């Protein structure tokens, strides 16, 4: 059971991070565009 | 030990974002403070 909870929260957090990281990829390239 | 290193994952993980979006939030704040 314990392993189950650890596992599930792992998958959720990688979901979260991937979305957040794509978003700021977009934001940083936007910052660079307004730089140029 | 199956716990010990599986559990050893999250703390670096939760440390990753916490450092990560900091500048990413700081920069987009610094996007907002001086652009719009």
């Amino acid at each position, epitope marked *: 059971a314990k392993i189950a*909870e650890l596992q599930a929260t792992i998958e959720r957090l990688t979901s979260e991070a991937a979305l957040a990281e794509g978003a700021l990829e977009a934001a940083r390239r936007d910052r660079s565009r307004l730089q140029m | 030990a199956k716990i010990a290193e599986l559990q050893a994952t*999250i703390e670096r993980l939760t440390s990753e974002a916490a450092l990560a979006e900091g500048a990413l939030e700081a920069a987009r704040r610094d996007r907002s403070r001086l652009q719009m």
Partner: nanobody
Amino acid sequence: DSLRLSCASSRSIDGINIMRWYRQAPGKQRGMVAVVTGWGSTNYVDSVKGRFIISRDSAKDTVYLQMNNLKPEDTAVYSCNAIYRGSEYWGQGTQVTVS
């Protein structure tokens, strides 16, 4: 400031998954502030080192977080926000002046 924060769950007490704090300057996108997990790991969002700190008991899952002699610009809605039992969950969020 000179105030206390008290963040609990009505259930799922202390099954301490990853669980987080949030804030948002209005008209914008809400985000990360502070997070504690199965270990109460000592990390938050960079803008904290020395200003926002965790402190927990499972009393009613009423985890706390330390918000003293503040920094103003945070003036916005704050919200602890926890993710439990394979699913995320969201609190109310309260308008808050800090300055």
